[PDB]
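Q: I'm writing up a methods section and want to include an example of the input and output format. Could you take the sequence below and give the corresponding predicted structure tokens, formatted cleanly so I can copy it straight into the document?
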Amino acid sequence: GPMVTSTGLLSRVAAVEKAAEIAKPPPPKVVELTEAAKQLPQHIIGVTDPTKLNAQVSYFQCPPWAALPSVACHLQCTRDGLPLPALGLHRFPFYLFGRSKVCDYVLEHPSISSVHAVLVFHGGQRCFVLMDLGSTNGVKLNGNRIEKRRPLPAPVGSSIQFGFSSRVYKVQLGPPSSS
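A: Here is the clean output for your methods example:
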């Protein structure tokens, strides 16, 4: 016979000439009694590297009300049409989405930039607050495209999207963990 068997593999797409900007901040400072001593960073942040924690401050800073939830909920993520098990993302104060090595999630897409957007557990409104740094394509909110550089609260029952990625963050309220 013809001996022809398809593999079901998708074709290939051309590449897009892209580049990255490497910043160069000033040197460290001696150890002395300063304001930071009284307003020291979080337990986990106090361990972060000097260039790492500083590279994340050039985009967004962690507020005081950050990492202070008052309701029990969970986050659901989709992958290739596969509904993965949702889990309370409270292991970290926030989560970055981009190509930057500093981001909490490094993906690969022509729409995803070094720093597309980042969400932080808003302890004031009890809901993750995601803000777009001003990407090209545009970030989605609650399943609907919206402006950028603005507070995009994605509470339980809502959804989140960024770039041309397939992964979708669907928030939802869970049962009472504390009896």
